[PDB]
Design a protein around this nucleic acid. Sequence first.
DNA 1: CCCGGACCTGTGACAAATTGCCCTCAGACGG
DNA 2: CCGTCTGAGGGCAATTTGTCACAGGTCCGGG
Length: 208
Amino acid sequence: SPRIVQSNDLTEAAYSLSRDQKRMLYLFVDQIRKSDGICEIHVAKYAEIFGLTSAEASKDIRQALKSFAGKEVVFYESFPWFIKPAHSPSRGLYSVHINPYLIPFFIRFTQFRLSETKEITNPYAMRLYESLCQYRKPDGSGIVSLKIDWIIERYQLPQSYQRMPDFRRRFLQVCVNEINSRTPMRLSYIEKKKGRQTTHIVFSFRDI
DNA sequence: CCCGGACCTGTGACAAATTGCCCTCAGACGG
DNA sequence: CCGTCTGAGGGCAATTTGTCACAGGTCCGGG
Ligand SMILES: [Mg+2]
């Protein structure tokens, strides 16, 4: 299946995208990399990749696309994703205008096969699997320590998850569970503390 | 000695949002 | 021209995600 690659600067960038928008984003990166910034999406091709009907595909593309307006990307400098609205010349076909200034940030890199992520539902969990891959070894294992405040900024978790028990229950446990249930990776963790405060989360993983 | 207060934890409610489903009906194409 | 495959619309209830009040732990410094 298609092998996604992206600069680590994008993996660690700050942004908020839905699953459907992130799903579309993978195809843009695939299209762009296999070469001005003008990409295209066919309804019927999208449907076959993610096992959806044409109708629900159409609904997902259409609503994702109009929700891009005003979205911005921060590299620690802010940029908009799109500089022109989407439009359909033909039935079943969409044409999109990615900000050409994003190109160099697209192409010290991260890689994963698309089948690894296409069953994930929660977008924050898609971002965690993208951030673990950045440190993965050939054989398929790795271990990395991420700071909680940096997790909150980079993934832009909503504000009420600054209370740690809500963070645990509605983000961490759920996203660890899906990965273990929906990917070929087996993930565990432990909490790092300083006094009463939890400061980092330590992830360990292996393949198969 | 024990207090109220500033911290920490997990859970129960409810509100807002998202999931995969369903139904209708005209466009684009080829038989 | 019509019968069929698409896909652009309109909806639903069942789940997930996002928010906050309240009980219950600790340690500190004042009474
Ligand atoms: Mg959907």
